[PDB]
Amino acid sequence: GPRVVRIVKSESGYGFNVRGQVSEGGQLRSINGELYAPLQHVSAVLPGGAADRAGVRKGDRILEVNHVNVEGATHKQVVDLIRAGEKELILTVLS
Amino acid sequence: PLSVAPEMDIMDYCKKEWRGNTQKATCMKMGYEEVSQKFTSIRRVRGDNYAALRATLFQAMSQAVGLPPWLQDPELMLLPEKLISKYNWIKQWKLGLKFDGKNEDLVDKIKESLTLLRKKWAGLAEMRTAEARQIACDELFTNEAEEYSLYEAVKFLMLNRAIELYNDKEKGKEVPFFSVLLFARDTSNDPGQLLRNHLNQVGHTGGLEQVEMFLLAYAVRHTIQVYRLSKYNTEEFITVYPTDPPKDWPVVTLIAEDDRHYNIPVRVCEETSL
């Protein structure tokens, strides 16, 4: 279900990986019995990093970043949004 | 009844279709972890005798941003009459289970199938977005007479190419290696034997053989790149038809879990660390 996890920039970075569609796309898929446009997902986590300690799990699909709905967003949209934050990162993810 | 099921994330497909840690499921999932480096999702292809043809055509047509020159070529629809007239044995053509006709009508049924292929491809190539094309293909691949008419067209194009390759071989021209293998089979020594004992049987007693994948690729001038999950950790894990693909041919990627179960990867991905 939806989970709002918070992670803080180490000077190393947030410490996972994000992977998802490059192009704009809205085709709906069934996830957990509900329909969603394509979602970016966590492709890797850094053991002993901010993401691992904070609670982000590999495979978690991202629904929001800093309260902004990224459902159906492009990879650059979410990445750029990730990098908009000064300090902190707030993610709403589905596990 | 979509013959190509709707999109599903690879993460969800494996969670559902390849549960457990048996060596088989583990192998499939490590294979899908490779597919997952380039795509996020897959669509399951109907596992009938046309599976390889359906996966290839769905991918090629849903990626169509233009009408390929060999399909746009207006001389293409003269090919059925010119070939059947030159080679009357082609009238041993066996129709798919969804059609029937008397051999007099063979020429115009093939021309009808070729016209359908061209029209659908042109229609898809005119649409502005890839998502719009996939929806249009979804309406096309409903397992009805139109979808299966396309296979009659492609199969006829495969026969024509095989005829051209055989003729080149006998005249002494250079031919691609796969053609030697194709006609080296005791059941397919010549194009007629290829028609009666293999092409005619796709849709009735089996699907395309491995080396007929080359013929299909040459027939629609598409490079067919197949993730063969059963051959993970080997050179054949990713097999390509043709083995040396021309740089101008468009590429379609398939996933063959086994030789009868095909998925198509969709939604190209890219990864960023953070």
Author numbering:
A (entry chain C): 40 to 134
B (entry chain A): 79 to 352
Give the authors' words:
Met1-linked polyUb is hydrolyzed by deubiquitinating enzymes (DUBs) such as OTULIN or CYLD5–7. Through its PDZ (PSD95–Dlg1–ZO-1) domain, SNX27 recruits membrane cargos and other proteins via their C-terminal PDZ-binding motifs (PDZbms). Using structural, biophysical, and cellular analyses, we demonstrate that OTULIN binds with high affinity to two distinct surfaces in the SNX27 PDZ domain and thereby competes in a non-catalytic manner for cargo binding, retromer assembly, and endosome-to-membrane trafficking. While OTULIN catalytic function prevents an overload of Met1-linked ubiquitin chains synthesized by LUBAC, OTULIN also regulates SNX27-dependent cargo loading, retromer assembly and endosome-to-plasma membrane recycling via a non-catalytic mechanism.
To unravel the exact binding properties and to explain the high affinity of OTULIN for SNX27, we determined the structure of the catalytically inactive OTULINcat (C129A) in complex with SNX27PDZ at a resolution of 2.0 Å in the triclinic space group P1. The asymmetric unit comprised two SNX27–OTULIN complexes that superimposed onto one another with an RMSD of 0.4 Å. As expected, SNX27 bound to the C-terminal tail of OTULIN comprising the PDZbm and did not affect the overall OTU fold (RMSD between apo OTULIN and OTULIN-SNX27 complex 0.9 Å). Close inspection of the C-terminal interaction interface revealed that the well-ordered OTULIN PDZbm engages with SNX27 in a canonical orientation identical to the described SNX27 peptide cargos like DGKζ. SNX27 His114, which was shown to be essential for cargo binding, forms hydrogen bonds to the peptide backbone of the OTULIN PDZbm and also to OTULIN Thr350 (-2 position in PDZbm), explaining the strict necessity of this interaction for complex assembly. Like all class I PDZbm interactions, the C-terminal Leu352 (P0) hydrogen bonds to the backbone of Tyr53 while the aliphatic side chain occupies a hydrophobic pocket on the SNX27PDZ surface. OTULIN Arg345 at P-7 hydrogen bonds to the side chain oxygen of SNX27 Gln60 and backbone hydrogen bonding occurs between Val346 (P-6) and SNX27 Val61. The structure revealed a second OTULIN-SNX27 interface besides the canonical PDZ-PDZbm interaction. The interface is composed of polar and electrostatic interactions with the side chain carboxyl groups of OTULIN Asp90, Asp87, and Glu85 hydrogen bonding to SNX27 Arg100 and Arg68. Thus, while the canonical PDZ-PDZbm binding interface is essential for the association, the second interface composed of the SNX27 PDZ β-hairpin loop and residues Glu85 and Asp87 in OTULIN contributes to the high affinity of SNX27 and OTULIN.
